[PDB]
Write a protein that binds this ligand. Structure first.
Ligand SMILES: [Zn+2]
Ligand SMILES: [Zn+2]
Ligand SMILES: [Zn+2]
Ligand SMILES: [Zn+2]
Ligand SMILES: [Zn+2]
Ligand SMILES: [Zn+2]
Lengths: 481, 481, 240
């Protein structure tokens, strides 16, 4: 059987159906509006109502509130409101169809086939892999034939996100460093033949003088990996690549500066930064975006042991700078210090890194937006514009020499791994990373607060969220224009 | 005797003196450069060197590094760098003159008499009032006669700040609610005859239905006050006023949600918001700025007792909204809810409030900038521009409906006093306040992280800092143009 | 004369793991070895006419799958069993064997130094290092030595009162931490008394004089090296 998701707008006499809803109402000789009318209150945005037996092929029709037809970019909220309405409403419709165990659903494009595809595929996603109680996986399809490219591009963007949620969600004993490197490799090679994957072993990592990455890694028995992803999509094979770097800690216990036990299981998602940048690169190659992109993810685990990093140790990063490890839980900093050095080798046009770096970001913006520190207002503008379309917001945070001073604490080393005071922890972790970039166009995104979803963005179940993957794909999309 | 502070720029053969330094070098027949040269390394920004006996009237000459003569607005740091250099350098020079107990100092204007006045008067400030060991108070004067208005306007701006540091620093048993109201009254009436002060007692406050302010206040024995300050500086006496509101908690213990003991003494500065907006209004009236300004500061103490607010209580704000007090330490929120209602009575052109609201602001930006939440980009732009001149930065933080949802937790009341989750505490405290403003141009400044100085801004001793008072005076200055 | 020094090169706490805050300073838990070895290098540069042996057990204290467990009973070189109730009271354990071995040398005097206890820091907090000694003659020579150097010593009690607190049988002859939290410096020293039979032993607890901030003006802020000159000066005068 099929289910049909149909949208309507908020209230004229009648609140308007979409063209597809209106066309369905004519095909059932006015029944759909009749029952909608005797059924109760007008549906508002994100609200659904389900009707049965109106048509032989659609035993379940779910009508969904899209909000005001007029909705556009909201200057205060910094997103396109209308598309947010369409993702929210279609996900709520689709999820009613899966609770009735119906295996396929025709979705009305609602005026924007791309965001309706994104609502349906985000909305229906689940991670029930290691459970014996799995949900019915239903397959969403565009209702109609008129903008199947826009539907399929949304399908594409919502899967990139879903790959990243899956990557993040999987338990750390399953998603080890080589296992993640293998999933990404497999996915990237299915995306395009214009790809190259290098799963670099410890041997290579130590030939590259990556001392601060290697010192995080040694306290675990799990072999680290340096994952080098290439998408050569430019016609000019010598066109300078954009490089994405991502913190891939596959589990963070804290090391010897050990984490509290409460809710420590969420640190399986400390490789969110690698999940995010690698999924956006798989999507860019599926999209055959005409640009060269390198992806760099140092993968390792941070564990207490008799060979772990000790508070006070001084390690040497690939640029020769010494780093005093004052707290072993400020490990991503260390990892990214070498990876951001290596990023420069590629002669990049742009360097963007992503990391679940700091609980300070969560106290600061708590999932309303991911924080970005950038030395370039041009980069800031392109990322900000990219998030107005996706609804997955970005908010700029300061790169002031003020926070740098706080981490240039000599004592034994050139730089300290944690700021001198507790204040502005996101700001001093970003200033730490500035010490390893000499590039005029670098952006640091702190993903820690947008790592999980509970109820905040309606089209995502409660779980690891995969954010800001579509802001990154959209940024690449527009850049390759 | 007099001391003379003279500046020089960083390195040509010779690093250049200012006109005044160069003129002094000619008056001592080349001695000053001679000794500067045999004395050691070239002074860099903020560095000083002191020379004795070059001239009969100036037994101590302190030469001060101004940095690069070319310094202007820094696009990355968002301030005028050169003026920051001049405040820093002159304060370091002036403080050498006070450590030698010299009672007067001629200060070179360094190309910007206003910032050199600001360095000297900020630099030399102290709060030693209740000590028997007091510092020599030296008197800084412009070296020369050429821009005595620019010198005196800086004197004016730096005193407004110093009034606010003094207000903040004083122990809470001395700076009670009527005592603060009396200091401000006295200062405002010395500033202009175009002023009106209303120290409103409890009787008035309860006739105005200010239930959420009154419920914070009742747990202390100290009578609360509502301070209404008017500066009628406009030619049009019916010109709509700008209104400034400020949290005046004179000591915050936490109430029944009691604070930890460690460093609780700093909550004598929880009236920083009232200190800041009242000092800027005293400065605006000294400056005879042609605008109408009302200042509103609810003053009270937050103490545990047998009549204190209890976690879970529901109080009624002046607009009739009920507020569930889930945590009694989120009291400023409550106080400001009534004051921001009353602000609307004045038919204001602009509503700006300031509050040491949240330690979450300190985790977020930690004294690199004060955070501002505003529903208007026009207000944001004027405040941001104002802080480029003063060096006392502002950084915009988001007013998203996302944080509103978190505080619209019904349960017993229309709004909860703390957000549902711990995340984004600054953002949900600001969204709480949005619930009490209907004005299209409101700005909320969270002053909590810029409350203290340790070493971060060089021209301020370690202590309560009085920030962002000059950003506010400067904003008023430009608005009255 | 034999000098013994705790050389823990990093102390994490083991399984009784330290809090994260400021744990980097435990790189200085070998301060006791640093102190006694530097004084012996100085005594030989000074060609002091005496025989000096220096003994420093050096190791690291880390959590792992083979680390000491709270409750374990280990056997010291004199055959006494020691119940390790808390793995962060490790220097105690280390010094127990080293102080046994010290006796082999037939020494005139046995002095050990250790950053043993944060309880010393609560007690005297860098105004002086604490010394527990069964001899007033040793106390007098060390005290006089610190009048010259300015790097003070303050005597702390070796009462059988604190011994009783650590003679808690339960599984072992001696427990590694005192029964109550009180007098932690005093019960850690009484623990060590259980391994000395020599009539002239001094225990110096160096924990509170480990760092300098502003307290003694001629030292920058950092690890301070105290009480090294009190020890050199004591040797100097002894060799007279
Ligand atoms: Zn960590
Ligand atoms: Zn981490
Ligand atoms: Zn409070
Ligand atoms: Zn407060
Ligand atoms: Zn220990
Ligand atoms: Zn130890």
């Amino acid at each position: 059987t099929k289910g049909l998701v149909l949208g309507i707008y908020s209230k004229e006499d009648e609140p308007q159906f979409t063209s597809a809803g209106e066309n369905f109402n004519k095909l059932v000789s006015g029944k759909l509006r009749e029952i909608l009318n005797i059924s109760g209150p007008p549906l508002k945005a994100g609200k659904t109502r389900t009707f049965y037996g109106l048509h032989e092929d659609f035993p379940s029709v779910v009508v969904v509130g899209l909000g005001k037809k007029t909705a556009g970019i909201d200057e205060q909220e910094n997103w396109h409101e209308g598309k947010e309405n369409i993702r929210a409403a279609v996900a709520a419709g689709c999820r009613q169809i899966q609770d009735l165990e119906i295996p396929s659903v025709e979705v009305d494009p609602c005026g924007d086939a791309q965001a309706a595809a994104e609502g349906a595929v985000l909305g229906l996603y689940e991670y029930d892999d290691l459970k014996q109680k799995r949900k019915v996986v239903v397959s969403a399809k565009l209702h109609g034939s008129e903008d199947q490219e826009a539907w399929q591009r949304g399908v594409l963007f919502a899967s990139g996100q879903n790959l990243a949620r899956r990557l993040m969600e999987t338990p750390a004993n399953e998603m080890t460093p080589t296992k993640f490197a293998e999933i990404v490799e497999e996915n990237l090679k299915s995306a395009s033949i214009k790809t190259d994957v290098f799963i670099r072993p410890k041997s290579w990592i130590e030939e590259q003088e990556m001392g601060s990455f290697l010192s995080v890694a040694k306290g675990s028995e799990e072999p680290p990996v340096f994952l080098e992803i290439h998408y050569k999509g430019s016609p000019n094979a010598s066109e300078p690549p954009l490089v994405f770097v991502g913190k891939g800690i596959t589990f963070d216990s804290g090391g010897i500066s050990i984490k509290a036990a409460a809710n420590m299981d969420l640190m399986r998602a400390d490789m969110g930064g690698a999940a995010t940048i690698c999924s956006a690169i798989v999507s860019a190659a599926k999209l055959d975006l005409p640009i060269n992109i390198v992806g760099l993810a140092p993968l390792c685990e941070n564990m207490p042991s008799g060979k772990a990093n000790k508070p006070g140790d001084v390690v040497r990063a690939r640029n020769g700078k010494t780093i005093q490890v004052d707290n072993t839980d400020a490990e991503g900093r260390l990892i990214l210090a070498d990876a951001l050095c290596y990023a420069h080798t590629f002669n990049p046009k742009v360097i963007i890194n992503a990391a679940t770096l700091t609980g300070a970001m969560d106290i600061a913006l708590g999932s309303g937006a991911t924080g970005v520190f950038t030395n370039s207002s041009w980069l800031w503008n392109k990322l900000f514009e990219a998030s107005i379309e996706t609804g997955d917001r970005v908010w700029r945070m300061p790169l002031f020499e003020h926070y740098t001073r706080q981490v240039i604490d000599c004592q034994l080393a050139d730089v300290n791994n944690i700021g001198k005071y507790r204040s502005a922890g996101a700001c001093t972790a970003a200033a730490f990373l500035k010490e390893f970039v000499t590039h005029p166009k670098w952006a640091h995104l702190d993903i820690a607060g947008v790592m999980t979803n509970k109820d905040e963005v309606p089209y995502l179940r409660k779980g690891m969220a995969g954010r800001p993957t579509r802001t990154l794909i959209e940024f690449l999309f527009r850049f390759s224009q």
